[PDB]
């Protein structure tokens, strides 16, 4: 579990020198964009369950053979587990957005997902589509201004689109 701060700390520990001035200048900018980071993380967990069901219907339409009998997500149990899991991507993504680093995302939700499926028989590609259907809706939920002050966070939202693309490409 690493931060943006402890990323710089563990990197400066390996060289064994003091923290340089521009690194403190860069981390002072993270303090200024710190309140926008709580704007984006609070907006996802409020719309957490609404974006799980909405990405599930768009997945199970466009691959109809899953629900269909013989499919990997056919019976109500496996289906329940798969549906439940789509939160676990979002659980570890919004951890990484609030952390600002992809270390927590890597060793919990990324380290064995492409591992565990060969023994399970679930298709890797199907899961990727599911997460890539979360990404265009999770970015779109945090994009629109309604009752918040207007700001610019395109340099910060691209981190969120990178986090889903890190989660997608490591499996499929």
């Amino acid at each position: 579990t690493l931060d943006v701060f402890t990323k710089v700390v563990s990197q400066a520990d390996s060289r064994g020198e003091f923290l340089s001035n521009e690194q403190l200048d860069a981390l002072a900018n993270v303090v200024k964009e710190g309140n926008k980071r709580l704007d984006v993380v609070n907006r996802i967990t409020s719309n957490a369950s609404a974006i799980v069901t909405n990405a599930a219907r768009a997945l199970f339409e466009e691959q109809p053979q899953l629900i269909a009998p013989g499919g990997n997500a056919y019976t109500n149990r496996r289906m329940a587990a798969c549906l439940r899991d789509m939160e676990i991507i979002l659980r570890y993504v919004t951890y990484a957005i609030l952390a600002g680093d992809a270390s927590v995302l890597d060793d919990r939700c990324l380290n064995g997902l492409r591992e565990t499926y060969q023994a399970l028989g679930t298709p890797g590609s199907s899961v990727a589509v599911g997460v890539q259907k979360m990404k265009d809706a999770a970015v779109g939920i945090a994009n629109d201004p309604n009752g918040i002050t207007k700001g610019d966070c395109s340099q910060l939202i691209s981190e969120v689109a990178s986090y889903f693309d890190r989660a997608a490409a490591a499996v499929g």
Partner: protein
Amino acid sequence: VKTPITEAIAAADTQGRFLGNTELQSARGRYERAAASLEAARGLTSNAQRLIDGATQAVYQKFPYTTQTPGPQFAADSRGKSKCARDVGHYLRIITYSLVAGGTGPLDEYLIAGLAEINSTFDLSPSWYVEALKHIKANHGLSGQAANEANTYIDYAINALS
């Protein structure tokens, strides 16, 4: 390591739930604290060569026998005094690390874990570095709210030595 961002993360992990408003308010407490803590780290990094010269000479005048007694553990020879500025030069890094990280993580992971374990073996008295840090506590030169933030980690290391 321990950081009040990751303290909010690891607490929400064991319950297996999302980042609610309980863990979220722990983040902005870390954020606005950094602006009184980052220039608290800039006061130490600019004065790096002053304090390790100051604390090392403060140790010798407090304990005059540590320059005279023959032994590896002491500072009688030159390589002892070369290892003197290495040790207090290693303390000021972690204080600047733990000020920038905003928690006692790097003080836990890099300094005080097993610190009472080694000093029994190499017979390094911890009261040597107590007086070393107390010179830095009085001569850091930091002022205002930022100084208070740099003052706790010095006192948190002292209570770990004792």
